[PDB]
Structure formats: C-alpha cells, structure tokens
Write a protein that binds this ligand. Structure first.
Ligand SMILES: [Cu+2]
Length: 639
C-alpha cells in the first residue's frame, strides 16, 4: 500500500467540474464518499472522446495542499484507470502555472497518490493525459485532496523542492542512461514487493526529463530479479548489475541500444554487495551476504572484453567486516568502494578498518588504517555514504550511517579521507563539526561545483518504517569545510531510497519502502533544484551553453576543446551515477583546469591516470562567473 503525507480535506462544500460525464456517472460521484459510485467520461451513446480528461475542484477556500489520492472504480472493470497524469494548483482558478506533480500510475485498481510539497491553493486540477491501457475514458470512484498542518515558504538561497514525479514502481535502484539522458529505475519482480519472488524477472521504469514521460516495462531476457544488487558502469559503457534476488546472475544494461543483455554468472552468489569499476574498466566486487548464503565471500573481477568473472580468493573480505549485531548477513554489505590507481580498489568503510584491495594475480588486501580523527576512532557506519568529490586530489567525504544495519542510532560523524598511492594509509580528518542531522539510509550526490548534496534517511534505522525521518538536506562545501542546511522536503526517503545527479544539474531523489503490504511504499521521486540555478530574485538564472565539443569520446590523458556562448570561469567532469541501498560507486568528480583560447573557446586535459579518470561516461559542466552551470555535455572516457 501507500499513503498520503497530509490529512483529507472535508469535501462538503466543494464544487467540481469535469470535461465530460456519463449520466449516472456524474462528476460529483467522485466526492460522494461511496466506493461503489464513480465519475466516468462520455462513452457509448455520447461517443468515446479520448484523453486528456480533466477533473477540477473548487474547494471554496485556500488550503495548504500537499497531495491528492485517486481510488479507481471498484467493480472489477478496468476502464478509465489513469495512466499518465498531471496535477495543478491555483489560487484563482485561471492561472494554473506548471504541474506540482506528474508522471504515471501503475495499471491496477489500487488507490493512487500524488504527494508533493505544500502549496496554498483553492483550486486543484487533475489531468488524465492517458488511460492506463490506452483506452479513451477516465473514471474515478473517490478523489481526495490532502493538507499539511501548516505552510512555511521556502527560504531564499537554500534551493527548492519540486515537482514530484509519480511512478508505477518504488524506484529502489536507479541509474542515468548516459546516451539518452533518461533515468532508469527498477524495483523487483513486481512494482512494490521483493518477498515471494519467482526469480527471473524485474519490473523497470524510466523517466525522460525532457518530455516528462514516465513508462514501465518488464525485463526477463537476463532471467534476473535485480532487487538488492551490486551496480557498476564498466569501461565498455555498460551497467553491470549483479546478484540480489537471483544471487548468481549478471545483467548488462546497454544505454546506446536501450536494452538488457545477459552476462556471465558470478563465481560466488551475492546480495547487497558493492561493486566498483576499476582503472582498466573491469568490475570488482566483494562481500554481499543478503542472498546466496551467509559464508565468507572474497573478491572477484568481471572482464567486459572476455565476458568472464574470475575469483580473487586472496582479496579477503574478512578485514572489512563490520561488527554488526546480525552477523555475517549484514557485516559484509554495502562496502564504500572506489576504483583507484593500478587496478586497486579502496574500501573506505562502513567498517572502522579501511583497506586497499588489489586485483593482480589471485588478489590481495592491505590494511589502510582506521577511519578516525582527533575526535577518536570512528565506529562502524553501516549505510553511511561515501562520495569522491575531488578525484584528482583523492578526496572522499564520508558521513552518517549506524553501527548496526537495523535498530541502531545513526551518527553525525563525517570524515575527509585523502587518498595517495595504493598501499599507503590515507590521512583522515573530521569534516567541519559533522552533520546537522544524524541519519542512516540517506543518499548523496556530488554536484558540479564540488559540493556534496545529502538528503533523507532516518535518525534510527528501521527498514519498512518511516519513523524518525530527516526532512532537511545538507550541502557540504569543501572550500569552506562547512555544512549548510537546505530547504526541507515533505516526503520520507529512508530505506530503499536513491538519489542521482541529473544531466541538467538538478538532483533526482526517490523511492523508499518496497515492503509489499506496508503503507510506506513511495511510488515517486522529487526534484531538488540547488541554489546555483537561481538568481538573487529567486528566478531561474540564465545558463551558459556548450555550443560545440571537439570530441565526444576521449582517452585518459587526452585533450578536449569546447566553444561556449558566454564566458566561463570553472568546469568539472562528473562520472555518471548508479544508486541502490545508499551505494553509488560510480559517481566522482574531476575539477578541470581550463585554458582560454580566446573567442569563448576553452580546452582541458582529461587526467592521464585512469584510476582517477575511471573509464565510462562522464558529464561535462561549465560554470559562468555567477556560478551557474550549463546542462551537461556527455563525454565517454576510454583507456
Ligand atoms: Cu533492500
């Protein structure tokens, strides 16, 4: 099930208007409080006019609206289910502005929700853009609108949340498809559940940021229920999805052809493992005792060119195990892995002990010291996050998490780890004074300017529960070694939530739940727009444009020249991201040294070390002097 975030508004004095209604299926049947009566658009004798269909509510007074719900017809007939839709709010009934929510609802008879940031309104409008199976009609048995207790205007300068993207699944895993710019998401064998799986199938969904279109589709060709997997973009530009509910399977997502391709089975069955792309484009993985048995799961490495997995039994998992109260089931999960120089992988946590993993021969592991500061040795930080915000200088920011996977208090601990050569112990210091809010199950992304956006989670980790939620995101700014609270959102994003940086420089944050009959499934995502996209008046700033690039594919050490439409001061490459269960081993940022060729032409070198400039797809952002980024240009980095 799902739930509104507000409380139902009394409908006693509402005035409703529909684009059409069949006699006996009047517009006002959708607010009469009877599950067996419903509004329905014209059919039969009145013709069958196709969508868009529209339902407008005049609530007579201003309400602090934060959602609506739609109960489909309950007579076993599927006609009129709403598929693609938009929600608009107005204080006057004539200026509707842009949708507060839009997307697509799953094709079934369950109650559907649109939850969004509180906005004072008198008029609510639901537009059914398509019917869930493509037929011409729209029908609703009960429509409700919800309100928050209060309304606080967002503070200037702290970013903005919205719109909500309504989805047909709970997006517990997600990736950007770099060649198309679409967000690819998946849940499990069905839209909202993972238990009882038959295996061999995953429900996927995509959102196109340019068209707003949400679609869904099953994937069965790779015979893989991809819930609870490792995720890495390899050096061949394919997304490697490993294990989970089908613990030995490997599935490959190819952005260029928008298709899934079977991969070779892993040597060891795993779930909840992390995987990381290496400097040679191969993929390393270790741990993962959620599925496949609770035995010691040492490292193994995937080669995209030979299409094989090879066991690395001397890359031992034992040194990175946490002290989790639930034992091995949890203690080898969600490692903080970063591909680094000469085929090495750095393991930053969640265990106190940090390690170097090596992939030559049959593998190796060397202690890299403890994660610590002058404040002391950091405890285990399961479901903390780790983000490499400056790969050139080896800078990783880590934060949050809790000693145990579940039923454990989150920490405000945050650290800066500075990587040098593999096999040396990195310097670690505390980041500022820690997080404002202790959180676990939170998610994070590095932004074009090098700051890290941190969002969601809960103060005490209880999977399936939306208790002790943290609604205020934070941004870490490294040049000031300072955290800044941003404007809060209204939807809990704890266990099974994700965040990704979009090519347009906004943050896509979604998911949470995926627990079947629970009421805490979030079939949605929200956009966060950082302050760097706004001018001093709170309007969207004019953005610099990249008008030409000299190449779209470059070797490490290679040079690129671009043309812009205006002067630019700064530029960065951000590797495209993949996300599930707090893990994102694919994102990282390289600050670029620009040289000016005159005539708004600028050049830069991609770092020659492929341990820094990990092969795969990258976003090129340029920033003007006001700090406004372009949208990203896509660059493939090869080695
Ligand atoms: Cu899970």
């Amino acid at each position: 099930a799902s739930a509104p975030i507000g409380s139902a508004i009394p409908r006693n004095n509402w005035a409703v208007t529909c684009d059409s209604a069949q006699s006996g299926n009047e517009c006002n049947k959708a607010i009469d409080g009877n599950k067996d009566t419903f509004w329905h658009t014209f059919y039969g004798a009145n013709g069958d006019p196709k969508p868009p269909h529209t339902y407008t509510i005049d609530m007579k007074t201003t309400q602090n609206v934060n959602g609506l719900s739609v109960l489909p017809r309950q007579d076993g007939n599927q006609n009129g289910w709403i598929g693609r839709h938009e929600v608009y709010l107005s204080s006057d009934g004539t200026n509707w502005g842009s949708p507060v929510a839009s997307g697509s609802w799953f094709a079934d008879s369950t109650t559907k929700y649109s939850n969004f940031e509180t906005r004072p309104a008198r008029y609510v409008r639901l537009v059914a853009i398509t019917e869930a199976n493509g037929q011409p009609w729209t029908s609703i048995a009960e429509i409700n609108v919800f309100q928050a207790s209060s309304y606080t205007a967002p503070q200037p300068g702290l970013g903005r949340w919205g719109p909500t993207i309504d989805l047909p699944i709970v997006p517990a895993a997600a990736a950007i498809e770099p060649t198309s710019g679409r967000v690819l998401m998946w849940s499990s064998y069905r839209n909202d559940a993972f238990e009882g799986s038959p295996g061999g199938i995953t429900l996927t969904s995509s959102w196109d940021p340019s068209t707003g279109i949400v679609s869904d589709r099953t994937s069965t060709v790779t015979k893989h229920d991809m819930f609870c997997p490792g995720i890495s973009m390899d050096g061949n530009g394919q997304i490697v999805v490993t294990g989970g509910n089908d613990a030995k399977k490997t599935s490959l997502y190819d952005s260029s052809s928008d298709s899934w391709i079977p991969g070779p089975d892993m040597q060891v069955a795993r779930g909840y493992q992390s995987s990381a792309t290496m400097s040679d484009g191969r993929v390393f993985t270790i741990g993962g005792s959620f599925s496949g048995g609770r035995v010691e799961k040492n490292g193994e490495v995937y080669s995209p060119s030979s299409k094989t997995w090879t066991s690395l039994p001397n890359a031992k998992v034992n040194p990175m195990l946490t002290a989790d109260k639930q034992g091995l089931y949890r203690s080898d999960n969600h490692a903080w892995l970063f591909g680094w120089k000469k085929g090495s992988v750095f393991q930053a946590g969640p265990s106190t002990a940090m390690n170097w993993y090596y992939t030559s021969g049959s593998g190796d592991v060397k202690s890299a010291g403890k994660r610590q500061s002058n404040r002391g040795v950091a405890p285990d930080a399961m479901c903390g996050n780790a983000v490499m915000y400056d790969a050139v200088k080896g800078k990783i920011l880590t934060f949050g998490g809790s000693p145990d996977y579940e039923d454990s208090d989150a920490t405000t601990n945050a650290h800066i780890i500075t990587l040098g050569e593999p096999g040396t112990s990195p310097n670690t210091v505390f980041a500022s004074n820690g997080l404002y809010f202790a959180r676990t199950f939170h998610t994070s992304v590095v932004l074009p300017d090098g700051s890290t956006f941190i969002t969601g989670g809960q103060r005490r980790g209880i999977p399936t529960e939306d208790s002790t939620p943290v609604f205020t995101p934070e941004i870490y700014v490294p040049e000031q070694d300072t955290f800044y609270k941003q404007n809060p959102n209204s939807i809990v994003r704890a266990y099974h939530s994700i965040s990704l940086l979009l090519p347009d420089g906004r943050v896509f944050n979604g998911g949470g739940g995926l627990c079947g009959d629970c009421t805490t499934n979030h079939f949605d995502a929200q956009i966060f727009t950082p302050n760097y996209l706004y001018d001093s008046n709170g309007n969207l700033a004019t953005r610099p444009k990249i008008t030409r690039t000299s190449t779209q594919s470059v070797k490490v050490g290679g040079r690129i020249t671009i043309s812009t439409d205006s002067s630019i001061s700064k530029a960065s490459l951000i590797r495209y991201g993949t996300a599930t269960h707090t893990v994102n081993t694919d994102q990282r940022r390289i600050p670029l040294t620009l040289t000016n060729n005159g005539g708004n032409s600028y050049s830069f070198q991609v770092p020659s070390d492929s341990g820094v400039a990990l092969p795969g797809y990258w976003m090129l952002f340029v920033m003007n002097s006001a700090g406004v980024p372009s949208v990203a240009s896509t660059i493939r980095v090869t080695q």
